[PDB]
Write a protein that binds this ligand. Structure first.
Ligand SMILES: *[C@@H]1O[C@H](CO)[C@@H](O)[C@H](O)[C@H]1NC(C)=O
Ligand SMILES: *[C@@H]1O[C@H](CO)[C@@H](O)[C@H](O)[C@H]1NC(C)=O
Ligand SMILES: *[C@@H]1O[C@H](CO)[C@@H](O)[C@H](O)[C@H]1NC(C)=O
Ligand SMILES: *[C@@H]1O[C@H](CO)[C@@H](O)[C@H](O)[C@H]1NC(C)=O
Ligand SMILES: *[C@@H]1O[C@H](CO)[C@@H](O)[C@H](O)[C@H]1NC(C)=O
Ligand SMILES: *[C@@H]1O[C@H](CO)[C@@H](O)[C@H](O)[C@H]1NC(C)=O
Ligand SMILES: *[C@@H]1O[C@H](CO)[C@@H](O)[C@H](O)[C@H]1NC(C)=O
Ligand SMILES: *[C@@H]1O[C@H](CO)[C@@H](O)[C@H](O)[C@H]1NC(C)=O
Ligand SMILES: *[C@@H]1O[C@H](CO)[C@@H](O)[C@H](O)[C@H]1NC(C)=O
Ligand SMILES: *[C@@H]1O[C@H](CO)[C@@H](O)[C@H](O)[C@H]1NC(C)=O
Lengths: 208, 342, 228
């Protein structure tokens, strides 16, 4: 009923955050900010009305069912997670986090087949690594015998590196041993701005 | 020309000077006699907006009924805010009379006569009256008693149905009697009788109306989720005594979707220690009077709340509501609003 | 000035019940409903229900019907929350809230200007389970002109956290230990990786040292190229 997007914004101070929320029903929509380790705060209510204490850099707008919170000239105190709300219903949230700008860097992509030690257990984990890339935005898709995979994968991302300002991501495809021994080609496909084309790293089960 | 406005209304009634009954005594000093030949003017080509949920007439009637009760139903002991007030508490004659509210000079009451008018929005048939109809200041929860019926269909009323915090008033078009009795010779134990055939047919009609407002979802009734006894039970005053009746049987989902065709009897009890609806604390009264205590009332409305939450099921659940006695006056004052002439 | 103060955080086991309090001040307590909202990391905020102080009238969220009870004390102007049959999913920070607009005559419940400071609650088993550690092996041929990636997969442990060092902390450059993910089984897993020169694969020994204080587990694992 309330669909907030995007999940994450990675921005520098001074830039503008644009956070949207689509509702399936018109009514008074409110926006909340939750700073780290602090209680949520009313930012906007009734779509565009600013709560007391909220500077005019925050502004709410609406186009049809789409409500937007735009935060201009981002300051330190603006980062955190934002939520849209309608009655008792809330959006999934939008995490606005500090990003330090650097040149684009394509990820170094590696894939790791399941250990033979793990295959004795009955489960198979295939790991794909995306190393030292920028910007944060990246997509990883798993393919097993050229079939797109959904719901059997989990990702994890590092904090932006203090030194080289890059990110690194790890995706894990998880299959039963039986299911794993059914197929041959295991591949993960990485799309990222630094790549002129999506890059696929793959291995064929059984052969070294 | 006129405009919406708020002013100090006055009261009219047919209170008897010889009557020792409480509502009569109050209205004698607070109100004027009624007009034998009232004047109603139907307005053609006139469309007005109404809002029963923002009608300050309700506020003034509330003040009155509070004043009436404070100056009449004095407890033996009044427990409020940490202190104790021990007064005299003789038994009283208690039977609500009709009360008319009227506008002073320069003002007038607009009345909405759309037969299917739901409480808010525009009205086509607008008439101009000086006073409202006679409204009995019946204080109760869950069920509206002795009120006026809806002319045509059963009307659903809410400030906003999509807001689960807003009370729903169900306005019936056919009344169902509720016959409450404390027999002679446990003195505090009592009961209410309701015709199961008539009620369940009405209740079924109610769910059918509710379907029209909730996308043909399954309409389920449930007992109150919690709160004080005054709201988790059908609370009302009959002949001075404070009744608490259990309405679980009244909202039998089985009977609205065989065998419940019979007499519904609700378990009630007369409590001497009550929570004051005027909004203070607890009040203690004398034990009930001897002999048969009996009140037969018209159930003319129902107070409901609707369940909410981040669910996804295709059934809406409703529970008996009330507690905000202002809503009681809203249900009778819904078709009126005050306007000032120029 | 409107204030809502909540009781302190607590920890619970699955199956327990919990009660928390919210003391209100700075306004006429009976005029407005008090709400309970819980925030868990990576989940939508969840409205649990409201309570109107006048009669203690309550409205519980459908999915919590039966497990939750909201009460109030009029004198101490304190609202109370109770949640029974706790499980892992109940782990969250619990807030009481009240609407911005509240007069003696009217209110709007849902614009939550006023929040209590929050009451963190953790529900978890007292049981611990040490990690399984599997090597993430480099590659087949040693490309003497590039760098290789290796690491170890630290799977199925409970609870948090585990730490990973390489070669007893001697190897730090190029190391990436990822934040753990919570698996469907209710157990955690993470990976630690490091990039090294490919030319050093038949010379240098690489060992990941996994530490899991709750299960009192320290395990070293040697990550070497597969032989075929
Ligand atoms: C219902 O609520 C919305 C906002 O939630 C408000 O704009 C609208 O005026 C309300 N409707 C009525 C009839 O009060
Ligand atoms: C208004 O009055 C006219 C004239 O009797 C009637 O036909 C019409 O049904 C009325 N409108 C409503 C909404 O009741
Ligand atoms: C009452 O009628 C108005 C005007 O048509 C409409 O906007 C509102 O939703 C209705 N309310 C109910 C409870 O049916
Ligand atoms: C109850 O309803 C009947 C008809 O339904 C009516 O004649 C009677 O006057 C009503 N009693 C009241 C309003 O007290
Ligand atoms: C009351 O209204 C319902 C529709 O809500 C209708 O089916 C029924 O016939 C009405 N009863 C009357 C007018 O006596
Ligand atoms: C109400 O019920 C009593 C028995 O409980 C019965 O004697 C009496 O006749 C009933 N009154 C009416 C008006 O039906
Ligand atoms: C209930 O009301 C019906 C009329 O709708 C009547 O025929 C029946 O006798 C009543 N039941 C009892 C037990 O009096
Ligand atoms: C009402 O009566 C039913 C009958 O079993 C009982 O279960 C319920 O607890 C009662 N409710 C109250 C509020 O006393
Ligand atoms: C509803 O009616 C059925 C059949 O008469 C009965 O068994 C059941 O107890 C009723 N539910 C109540 C009284 O809550
Ligand atoms: C409803 O009105 C009748 C008289 O018409 C009276 O006997 C009965 O007690 C009233 N009910 C209440 C709850 O006041």
């Amino acid at each position: 009923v309330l669909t907030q997007s995007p999940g994450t914004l990675s921005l520098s101070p001074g830039e503008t955050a644009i956070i949207s929320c689509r509702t399936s029903q018109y009514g008074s929509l409110a926006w909340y900010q939750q700073r780290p380790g602090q209680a949520p705060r009313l930012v906007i209510y009734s779509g565009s009305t600013r709560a007391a204490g909220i500077p005019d850099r925050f502004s709410g707008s609406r186009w049809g069912p789409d409500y937007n919170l735009t935060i201009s000239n981002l300051e330190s105190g603006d980062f955190g997670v934002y939520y849209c709300q309608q009655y008792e219903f809330f959006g999934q949230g939008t995490k606005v986090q500090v990003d330090i700008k650097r040149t684009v860097a394509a990820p170094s992509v590696f894939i790791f087949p399941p250990s033979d030690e793990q295959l004795k257990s009955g489960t198979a984990s295939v790991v794909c690594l995306l190393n030292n890339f920028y910007p944060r935005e990246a997509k990883v898709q798993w393919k097993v015998d050229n079939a797109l995979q959904s719901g059997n994968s989990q990702e994890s991302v590092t904090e932006q590196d203090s030194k080289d300002s890059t990110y690194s991501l790890s995706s894990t495809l998880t299959l039963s041993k039986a299911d794993y021994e059914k197929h041959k080609v295991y591949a993960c496909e990485v799309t990222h701005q630094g790549l002129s084309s999506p890059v696929t790293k793959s291995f064929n089960r059984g052969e070294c | 020309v006129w405009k919406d406005a708020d002013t100090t209304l006055f009261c009219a009634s047919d209170a008897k000077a010889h009557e020792t009954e409480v509502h009569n005594v109050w209205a004698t000093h607070a109100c004027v006699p009624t007009d034998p030949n009232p004047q109603e003017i139907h307005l053609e080509n006139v469309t007005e907006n109404f809002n029963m949920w923002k009608n300050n007439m309700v506020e003034q009637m509330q003040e009155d009924v509070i004043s009436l009760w404070d100056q009449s139903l004095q407890p033996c002991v009044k427990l409020t805010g940490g202190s104790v007030i021990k007064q005299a508490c003789p038994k009283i004659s208690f039977d609500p009379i009709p009360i008319h509210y009227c506008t002073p000079a320069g003002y007038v009451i607009l009345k909405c006569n759309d037969k299917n008018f739901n409480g808010t929005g525009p009205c086509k048939n607008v008439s101009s009256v000086q006073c409202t109809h006679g409204i009995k200041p019946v204080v109760s929860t869950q069920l509206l008693l002795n009120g006026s019926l809806a002319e045509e269909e059963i009307i659903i009323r809410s400030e906003n149905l999509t807001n689960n915090a807003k009370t729903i008033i169900v306005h019936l078009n056919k009344s169902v009697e509720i016959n409450c009795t404390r027999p002679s010779n446990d003195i505090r134990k009592a009961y209410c009788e309701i015709n199961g055939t008539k009620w369940n047919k009405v209740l079924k009609q109610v769910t059918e109306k509710l379907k029209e407002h909730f996308n043909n979802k399954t309409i389920i009734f449930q007992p109150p989720s919690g709160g004080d006894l005054e709201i988790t039970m059908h609370h009302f005053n009959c002949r001075g005594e404070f009744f608490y009746c259990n309405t679980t049987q009244l909202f039998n989902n089985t009977c609205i979707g065989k065998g419940c065709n019979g007499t519904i009897t609700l378990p009630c009890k007369i409590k001497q220690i009550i929570n004051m609806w005027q909004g203070t604390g607890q009040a203690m009264y004398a034990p009930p009077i001897d002999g048969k205590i009996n009140c037969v009332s018209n159930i003319t409305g129902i107070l409901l709340t609707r369940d909410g939450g981040a669910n996804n099921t295709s059934n809406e659940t409703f529970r008996p509501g009330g507690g905000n006695i202002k809503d009681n006056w809203r249900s009778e004052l819904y078709k009126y609003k005050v306007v000032q002439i120029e | 000035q409107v204030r809502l103060s909540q009781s302190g955080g607590q920890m619970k086991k699955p199956g327990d019940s919990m009660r928390i309090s919210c003391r209100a001040s700075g306004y006429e307590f009976i005029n407005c409903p008090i709400n309970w909202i819980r925030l868990a990391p990576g989940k939508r905020p969840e409205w649990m229900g409201w309570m109107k102080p006048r009669w203690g009238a309550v409205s519980y969220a459908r999915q919590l019907q039966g497990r939750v009870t909201m009460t109030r004390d009029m004198y101490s102007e304190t609202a109370f929350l109770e949640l029974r049959s706790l499980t892992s999913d109940d782990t969250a920070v619990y807030f009481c809230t009240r609407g911005k607009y509240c007069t003696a005559r009217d209110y709007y419940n849902w614009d939550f200007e006023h929040w209590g400071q929050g009451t963190p609650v953790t529900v978890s088993s007292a049981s611990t389970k040490g990690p399984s550690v599997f090597p993430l092996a480099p590659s087949s041929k040693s490309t003497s002109g590039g760098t290789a990636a290796l690491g170890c997969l630290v799977k199925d442990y409970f609870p948090e956290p585990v730490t990973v060092s390489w070669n007893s902390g001697a190897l730090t450059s190029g190391v990436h230990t990822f934040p753990a993910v919570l698996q469907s089984s209710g157990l955690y897993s993470l990976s630690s990786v490091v990039t090294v020169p490919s030319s050093s694969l038949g010379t240098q020994t690489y060992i990941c040292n996994v530490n899991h204080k709750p299960s009192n587990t320290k395990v070293d694992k040697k990550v070497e190229p597969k032989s075929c």
